[PDB]
Amino acid sequence: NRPKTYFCDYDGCDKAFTRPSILTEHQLSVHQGLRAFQCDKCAKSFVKKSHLERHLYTHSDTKPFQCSYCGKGVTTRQQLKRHEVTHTKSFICPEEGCNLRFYKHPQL
DNA sequence: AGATTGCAGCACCTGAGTTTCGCGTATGGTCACCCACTACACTACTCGGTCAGGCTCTTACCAGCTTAACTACAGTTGATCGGACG
Ligand SMILES: [Zn+2]
Ligand SMILES: [Zn+2]
Ligand SMILES: [Zn+2]
Ligand SMILES: [Zn+2]
Numbered sequence A: 001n002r003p004k005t006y007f008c009d010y011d012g013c014d015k016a017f018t019r020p021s022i023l024t025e026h027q028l029s030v031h032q033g034l035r036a037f038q039c040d041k042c043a044k045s046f047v048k049k050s051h052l053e054r055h056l057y058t059h060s061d062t063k064p065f066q067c068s069y070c071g072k073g074v075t076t077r078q079q080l081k082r083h084e085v086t087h088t089k090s091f092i093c094p095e096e097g098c099n100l101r102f103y104k105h106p107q108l
Numbered sequence B: 001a002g003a004t005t006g007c008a009g010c011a012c013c014t015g016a017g018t019t020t021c022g023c024g025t026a027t028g029g030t031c032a033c034c035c036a037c038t039a040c041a042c043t044a045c046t047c048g049g050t051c052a053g054g055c056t057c058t059t060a061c062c063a064g065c066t067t068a069a070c071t072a073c074a075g076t077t078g079a080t081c082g083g084a085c086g
Helices: A020-032 A048-057 A077-086
Strands: none
Touching: none
8 A cells, every 4th residue: 555665774675664663673683684583492583473472372272273173283373274275176187178177186 | 958860899600712631533553363485305006026826828849851941072363451641
């Protein structure tokens, strides 16, 4: 919506941003080499609250997305969708007019 | 010097210029969520080479003979070869 009208000034940086706090998040993270959210359970650190929140689940068994078929736990919707698509007849015969459909790619 | 009258002084209701304000309307700004793309390391089924098993084909025969060619003996002549020349 609103136009990108805050330009990073550093040598060899191309980026422009919508609102000045975001330009500052970029500058402190990329160019100065500082981060604002530390893991309690390992050495790593993160640039956003949502990124530390994802990393915190990785230290735990009670992972926040749970499979509808097998009940395996995962941390975000992309992982869930890819995993659940393995519980489907995903693959299709690529050859002309052939009707068949398959569950594991080596079968196809 | 009184009957007629104006000045103008008192008080209280009122009006605008000026101000402060509330909202619309709309605009830049915070920040929280969750999505897309990327990617190092991984999961797992198939293909592929190799091997055995054991069923399978096809050979060619023994000494002799009897149909078939070689395989040695044998003689004057080549032209690379040694090793020395230019
Ligand atoms: Zn930059
Ligand atoms: Zn950690
Ligand atoms: Zn599952
Ligand atoms: Zn097919």
